[PDB]
Design a protein around this ligand. Sequence first.
Ligand SMILES: Nc1ncnc2c1ncn2[C@@H]1O[C@H](COP(=O)(O)OP(=O)(O)O)[C@@H](O)[C@H]1O
Ligand SMILES: Nc1ncnc2c1ncn2[C@@H]1O[C@H](COP(=O)(O)OP(=O)(O)O)[C@@H](O)[C@H]1O
Ligand SMILES: O=C(O)c1sc2cc(F)sc2c1Cl
Ligand SMILES: O=C(O)c1sc2cc(F)sc2c1Cl
Ligand SMILES: O=C(O)c1sc2cc(F)sc2c1Cl
Ligand SMILES: O=C(O)c1sc2cc(F)sc2c1Cl
Ligand SMILES: O=C(O)c1sc2cc(F)sc2c1Cl
Ligand SMILES: O=C(O)c1sc2cc(F)sc2c1Cl
Lengths: 319, 319
Amino acid sequence: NQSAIDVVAEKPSVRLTPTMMLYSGDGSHLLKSGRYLQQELPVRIAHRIKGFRSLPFIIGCNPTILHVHELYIRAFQKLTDFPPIKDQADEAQYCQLVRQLLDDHKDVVTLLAEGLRESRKHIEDEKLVRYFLDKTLTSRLGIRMLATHHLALHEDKPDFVGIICTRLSPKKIIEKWVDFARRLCEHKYGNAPRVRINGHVAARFPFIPMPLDYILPELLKNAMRATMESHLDTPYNVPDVVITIANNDVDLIIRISDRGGGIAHKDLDRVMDYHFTTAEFGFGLPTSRAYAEYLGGSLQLQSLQGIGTDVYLRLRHID
Amino acid sequence: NQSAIDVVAEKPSVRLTPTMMLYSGDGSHLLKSGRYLQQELPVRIAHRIKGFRSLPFIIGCNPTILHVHELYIRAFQKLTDFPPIKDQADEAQYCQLVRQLLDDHKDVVTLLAEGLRESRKHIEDEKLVRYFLDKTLTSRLGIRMLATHHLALHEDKPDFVGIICTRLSPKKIIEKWVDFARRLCEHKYGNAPRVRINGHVAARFPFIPMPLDYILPELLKNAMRATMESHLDTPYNVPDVVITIANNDVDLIIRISDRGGGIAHKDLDRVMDYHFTTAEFGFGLPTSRAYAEYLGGSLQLQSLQGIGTDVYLRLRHID
Ligand SMILES: Nc1ncnc2c1ncn2[C@@H]1O[C@H](COP(=O)(O)OP(=O)(O)O)[C@@H](O)[C@H]1O
Ligand SMILES: Nc1ncnc2c1ncn2[C@@H]1O[C@H](COP(=O)(O)OP(=O)(O)O)[C@@H](O)[C@H]1O
Ligand SMILES: O=C(O)c1sc2cc(F)sc2c1Cl
Ligand SMILES: O=C(O)c1sc2cc(F)sc2c1Cl
Ligand SMILES: O=C(O)c1sc2cc(F)sc2c1Cl
Ligand SMILES: O=C(O)c1sc2cc(F)sc2c1Cl
Ligand SMILES: O=C(O)c1sc2cc(F)sc2c1Cl
Ligand SMILES: O=C(O)c1sc2cc(F)sc2c1Cl
């Protein structure tokens, strides 16, 4: 066992405010920020190692689960071996290790789902598995936003302070993912539902697109697939998917309404479980919910069995 | 104190199934049903007397609350003094007392809200008050359906077995209350939102209209009022209220969508409390929710602050 990991496995995380990210974004400010990252990332990694150590032995023993645990141990070793950042050249050296770790851990979610799939015969508690996956994936999301934000601060990209867009239009980010989903849908069925966008279509505000880039294609794929499966007898005459944007001082709400038949009563208690899918890998819906909650929001579903489903994505604002 | 009340205050209620109501509905069947009512009503009344006896003393002491408690004691005395139903003439005698008690207790909800309003300075628990009102009003709803159903069984009214409509159209019962709400709305503002009805508009099925006759005008008044208050600057150009009917083997779902600005974040935790209203008596929403839950369903709200509100009324089917 590694005693260095034990030293910070229970140290509370120091949270960088999404408002503080705008406040610091530069040369001398990049150094203070890089010093923060250097000290904070091993703590976040150690909290994840603690999670793998706390798994029931028969699950933690899985070679795929063990491989992810060992990747986290490797990441902690590499981040802690690095000398302190005294100057901007030291700050730059560190950035290249962060880029390497961002790519080395690209498939962690895939590996975890694989390991847990192979260990399904030893899982008697979906609430324990939900806790492990919600905690692991949201904390990994937090590590990724910190890492990507710091790297992006080195660019003079328009309307962006790192990963924060200063003038994010929800209508534009929704339109981008609607085009992507309609193309995949059209390839599979020969047609895709037309998507209408209404509400506060002219809203623009400081926002981090990363969560929306994950959640939006997941909800659009679900609404479009349910609409096509529900109308196989009339595939070229399908009802529209309606998206409403509601923007207020507190949060952004995105409502996605489909006429895809609804989520059956028997399936409604399982649609938010990991691995659960009625398609022919069940991670889109529980991961989107855990991400929205991690960011101060929520993901709620309202089923109208025989008609369709309304999905409400609520995300707390920057300020 | 009355010892007869004590004898049945904890006796469990025997539930008449909404399916059993169709199964019995006649002369000899009316007698067995009237015998059931005679024995069941004092038990339901005694459960309510127990509720008034269990209120904190400072609240139960209120003369308005005491007047309702004393009305229930009177109803128990009158129902128990009546001799057993040996024949159809005895069954008919009992019906006339039930009619009198139905009218004598017409305003019980009004009296209870008044008594609790005068005792607000001594209420430190909205969860206790919610429990008392949810239990009292839903059990009173149950007493009223039993009483009205038995009386209605004496009629040869088309498409009705007592209070059960054998071919209830949700679109027709919604249209009836839309006309009522639009007229009241037009009187107050000079205009009312146009109501569109979609989904399963041709659905017809066995159903008891009584719950819908209470809940529908409450949700329509709220959706229409919020729409008019939200558009005072353009009172003759207001967005439509959209109602969707979803009918499946398990339940009927009625979605009411408005563009009335939404329910504010500060008010969202209080809209389901009794007495809470932002209008210039806050019972419509908590009573509708308690009624829908009492009948195996639910009443759920989804707020899009800055845009509008979606209300979902779910009611379990007869079978
Ligand atoms: N809009 C919707 N309409 C109908 N069914 C839906 C909808 N959204 C989700 N579902 C159901 O929830 C299930 C779980 O979805 P999810 O967890 O996102 O994973 P996956 O996309 O792999 O199926 C889906 O397989 C589908 O049965
Ligand atoms: N559709 C809606 N749009 C906006 N506000 C609503 C809506 N439905 C309910 N509300 C809010 O909830 C409050 C409580 O409603 P309710 O309990 O039905 O009582 P009341 O009709 O006496 O106000 C309302 O006063 C209003 O502020
Ligand atoms: O992140 C954490 O703090 C923890 S504690 C714990 C216990 C488990 F069984 S999984 C798990 C995780 Cl993921
Ligand atoms: O699990 C991940 O996705 C990542 S990305 C990244 C960048 C770092 F600097 S550590 C680290 C980890 Cl642990
Ligand atoms: O039917 C399917 O299986 C799929 S997968 C997918 C991904 C998208 F973005 S849309 C879409 C559809 Cl419609
Ligand atoms: O119906 C009941 O069984 C009861 S028990 C109880 C305790 C209270 F404080 S009110 C109340 C009611 Cl309404
Ligand atoms: O509270 C009420 O609304 C009613 S109506 C009715 C009819 C009866 F026969 S008893 C009784 C009561 Cl207790
Ligand atoms: O604005 C109001 O106060 C009211 S009260 C009422 C009752 C109805 F049925 S509609 C309606 C409206 Cl719109």
